[PDB]
Amino acid sequence: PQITLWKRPLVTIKIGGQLKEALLDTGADDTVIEEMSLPGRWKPKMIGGIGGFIKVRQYDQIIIEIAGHKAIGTVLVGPTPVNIIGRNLLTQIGATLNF
Amino acid sequence: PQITLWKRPLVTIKIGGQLKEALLDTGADDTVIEEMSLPGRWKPKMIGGIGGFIKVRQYDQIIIEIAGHKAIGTVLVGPTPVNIIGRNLLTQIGATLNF
Ligand SMILES: CCCC[C@H](NC(=O)[C@H](C)NC(=O)[C@H](CCC(=O)O)NC(=O)[C@H](Cc1ccccc1)NC[C@H](CC(C)C)NC(=O)[C@@H](NC(=O)[C@@H](N)CCCNC(N)=[NH2+])C(C)C)C(N)=O
Numbered sequence: 001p002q003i004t005l006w007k008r009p010l011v012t013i014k015i016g017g018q019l020k021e022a023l024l025d026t027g028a029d030d031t032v033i034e035e036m037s038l039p040g041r042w043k044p045k046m047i048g049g050i051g052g053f054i055k056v057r058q059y060d061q062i063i064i065e066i067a068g069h070k071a072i073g074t075v076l077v078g079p080t081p082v083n084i085i086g087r088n089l090l091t092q093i094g095a096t097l098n099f
Numbered sequence: 100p101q102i103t104l105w106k107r108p109l110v111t112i113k114i115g116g117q118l119k120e121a122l123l124d125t126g127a128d129d130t131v132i133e134e135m136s137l138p139g140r141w142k143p144k145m146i147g148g149i150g151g152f153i154k155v156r157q158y159d160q161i162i163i164e165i166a167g168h169k170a171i172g173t174v175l176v177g178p179t180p181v182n183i184i185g186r187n188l189l190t191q192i193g194a195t196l197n198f
Pocket residue numbers: 023025027028029030031032047048049050081082084086122124126127128129130131144145146147148149179180181183185
């Protein structure tokens with residue numbers, strides 16, 4: 001699909017059996033989701049952006065469905081104000097910026 | 100052009116006759132650049148990101164070139180970790196996300 005940017009590029013995702021809304025963020029290296037449980041092992045991480053840093057849990061090899069497209073990758077879980085799909089999974093769905 | 104996301108989508112911008120690097124950010128409502136001098140009056144804004152809120156200076160109707168494409172619009176100046184081009188100017192250069 002082609003998403004214009006007049007409004008926030010929000011899509012439905014499916015992660016850990018749950019449907020969530022998330023923002024497609026080309027300015028995000030990583031994917032970060034609000035607090036939830038995910039299976040498997042995790043390790044602590046700090047991620048930063050505007051306003052400074054937050055502590056998250058890093059889960060690897062997590063499968064996710066993004067607007068109907070399946071991908072696998074690292075998912076960070078923590079007190080993010082918005083669910084964000086970052087470049088590590090945008091690539092897997094073949095997303096590009098075009099102008 | 101068409102930009103894939105395996106690396107950060109960094110472009111050159113030109114503002115106040117100076118060249119700078121900036122990140123195309125579909126997850127940003129607004130354009131935010133590091134401390135610099137811009138003409139005219141400014142107004143206060145608070146913007147939030149992953150780690151909380153920062154105060155910025157809002158300048159309207161600023162001429163800026165982005166990857167060779169001319170835009171004229173609002174630029175926020177403040178303690179951002181990286182220069183970001185947000186949706187307010189990505190729409191002016193006709194950018195879309197595609198997958
Ligand atoms: C009346 C006026 C109000 C308007 C004002 N609007 C905002 O605050 C809006 C929602 N904020 C945003 O749109 C801001 C950008 C700033 C701006 O646009 O103004 N967006 C953002 O900050 C979005 C995510 C987000 C989106 C919506 C809400 C919250 C967060 N992330 C953009 C941000 C760019 C970064 C490189 C500086 N990316 C990130 O923060 C990601 N970080 C990374 O990718 C890091 N690994 C990069 C390392 C950089 N440096 C370092 N470590 N030293 C993170 C998600 C993993 C408000 N107060 O609501």
